[PDB]
Symmetry: D2
Subunit: 245 residues, 4 copies
Amino acid sequence: GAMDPAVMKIEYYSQVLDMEWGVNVLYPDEDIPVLYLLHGMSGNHNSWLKRTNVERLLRGTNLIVVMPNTSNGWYTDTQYGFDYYTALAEELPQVLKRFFPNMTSKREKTFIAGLSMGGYGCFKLALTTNRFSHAASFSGALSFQNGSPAYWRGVFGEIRDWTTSPYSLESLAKKSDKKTKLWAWCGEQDFLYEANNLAVKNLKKLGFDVTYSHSAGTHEWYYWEKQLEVFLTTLPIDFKLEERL
Amino acid sequence: GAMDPAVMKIEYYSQVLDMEWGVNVLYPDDIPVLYLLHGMSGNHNSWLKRTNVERLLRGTNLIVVMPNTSNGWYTDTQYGFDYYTALAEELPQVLKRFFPNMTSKREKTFIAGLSMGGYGCFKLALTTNRFSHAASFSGALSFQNFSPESQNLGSPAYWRGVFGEIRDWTTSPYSLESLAKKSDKKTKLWAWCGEQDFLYEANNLAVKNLKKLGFDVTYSHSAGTHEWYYWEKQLEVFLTTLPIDFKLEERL
Amino acid sequence: GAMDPAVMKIEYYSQVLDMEWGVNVLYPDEDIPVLYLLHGMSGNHNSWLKRTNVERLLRGTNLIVVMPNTSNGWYTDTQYGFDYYTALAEELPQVLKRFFPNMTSKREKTFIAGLSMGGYGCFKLALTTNRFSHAASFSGALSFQNFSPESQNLGSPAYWRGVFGEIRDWTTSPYSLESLAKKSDKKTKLWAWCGEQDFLYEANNLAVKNLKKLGFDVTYSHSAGTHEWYYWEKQLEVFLTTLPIDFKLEERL
Amino acid sequence: GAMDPAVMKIEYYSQVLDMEWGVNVLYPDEDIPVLYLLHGMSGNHNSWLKRTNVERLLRGTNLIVVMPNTSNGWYTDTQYGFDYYTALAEELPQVLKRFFPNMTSKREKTFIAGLSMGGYGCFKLALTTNRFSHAASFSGALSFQNFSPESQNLGSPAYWRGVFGEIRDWTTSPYSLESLAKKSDKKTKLWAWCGEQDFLYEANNLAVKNLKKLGFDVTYSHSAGTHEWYYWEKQLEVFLTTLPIDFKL
Ligand SMILES: [Ca+2]
Ligand SMILES: [Ca+2]
């Protein structure tokens, strides 16, 4: 309907991945603000569309939403020759800006959010690029300090100590100018609650602006959507939630 | 994920419409079937675009079929598009060919719709006698006491395209009351409307008339307007009335 | 692969149609030329992608291709309240300009093409908008003066009345290309092909004759051929070689 | 139109890959024959739909066409934990059989074809499963004994290691079609075409020679052509004429 976002289901060639690849875009209704919205493990670019009311949530909101695909590659340039980090941090923004010149190129209007694996990817991209002003993690896999062996090796190689490896958010934080607002939620009955506690505590000590919340909840889409609703209210976009009598 | 429905987006040729046409189907991980009908301005993508129906169906043994009537009111129109025949007769035949494991039993065959889709839902239930349960969410269930111009909906030519010239709605062949003559009364009818919906009085009237005709109608109403948030909530309630062992997601 | 166009399946709201609606876009891999490519009766915005190799054809070509949907409404503001002409001639270009500012807004680089019902729609939009430099019809339904849908039992009386109302005489009705031509500045290069074994061949001969009499720039070609996708695909290939876009046909040894 | 195949674009969960995954199906519009149609490198389940007139080709043909996705994984259970072979050889057919009970479960009505990487994957599935009666390769990557991907700027050392591990000699490796052929009952008709100007021409010549030596029924053709979709579409047409489906043109 009127005020609902247009939806762009995009098939594009990734030179970085040497693959025909996919992204979804929600386009409002120029310097239009952008939110990158990252899926978790087992997911892809369709996840937020399949698993939440993000479309309804974006009604009347001047915000472009970009949903990338990392296909179980952890937003990482992998050991097996698939450069997912490069494809999504570098190539995708270039591809989209070419299609959509009215999308903002300003940090203060560029945001990121993800759930689980996407929570890790979100914080990683926020810390390494310095191109985002706000970054949100919902039940993120924020630390491995506390699949299959071949699978995990494919992502991270051999890991002795997670926190001191270049893959930890603590280590990636060294690349950050610390000017990104970080936002995190985790359910208190989530298996990743303690990983979130450790990562948040570390990032705060390292001097980062981290707004961490936690409440009753488990590792489920209902909660991640609810927390996206909360995160959107923190953005400079004048968001309004639907009436719910 | 595991237990989530498969989604198939189907491009098929409608011989009835003489059109390339489309439908969406959710297929679970003699399987019951729910036909889920869109409203005005909508199409076969509406329920997927506007609700968490996909997430709602996790772990539930139910095929969901989403047809498209493209603003044609689930009606064989005045302008040569036989949408009723295409969706009531052709689509079920097409899908049965693809999906032989879909039930052919009335007791396992259901339909639901919102607004124009609530009208279409009750029309199909009353005319076919092939459904056991039929639900309307803020349905356009009568035009006797509701005029679309009060809400700047369509135009005189558009309405004439669907229904022709209508002197009196209820006594016309298009009313649910008139269409009810084709019904064996053995379909459970289920309706909700928000008390702040422009269609509240239309629902009140149609429900009273169908009950007076001896239909089994379960009508509920509460705070609410003409919005997707409510239709999604009421689909959730309706699913609990079906013989499908549905359980809602955890919400702490 | 590399050099292949990106494909955009677009779900947008049409205020004109009061509908959730759709279009497909091929976007080359900056004032980029655009071709609007119109489907025929029984088709939709998916037709050219489903029924031809247009995607493979556009490899390495700097041209955006827009495939709209008129859903059997003849690119016409109908008698039953669906304003397909306004939706496609007016609203769609505005919607696309907003999404794609790098798409050209110049007549010199804006083109249109269509098969059958889409050939009619193509010439109609070319004549009435003055926004296109080149317009191509493939086996177009260019006249109903000497063609009747009753010859092949296409549609139904109610269907045709739904599109055009009651017509005494096609050529003198406001729906004819001959009537619609009055809105044209005559600056569009019109291009038409029709197969000699097509039910629409004489309709093409007549429309072409009439438009040339009115002083239009019309290039008309015909050869053995029938009312089939094989021919429409072949003629699209020919049309692309005529456009100011550096098109090169794939190798076929 | 009338007689054209229905198209279903399918999103399903792959337990084997722990992925939301995809396949396309053309369904003719009862024991219906099935063709698995495999994409090449850089492609996916959409490849044959995007790059050919396969839809038009199948008008009036009683054949289901299944297009899987191996996402640059070479139809192989990889060294990095993605079991593409198992997902496509075992899981996908079980998934589709559940949706479509009218699809054949007979070997004599089950066929497979692929281009490039898909030619390799096709012959691999045919040799290993013994569940197909006819298998076709179009410009297939049928051997790496005499072809190095580096010559065409394809992949990277890390990429190839991810698929095949370290390879001292291709033909004697368990990954070669020659080695995979040990699992075959030889009761699958193999069909191959390659362009005489294709960079994979010599790889085809070698694999065909070897499979013939091993006692396989291999129909191999070659003519003018390069590594392009135009040729693969034409050759799919020729392959269809060899199938027990009364294909028309
Ligand atoms: Ca959705
Ligand atoms: Ca295609």
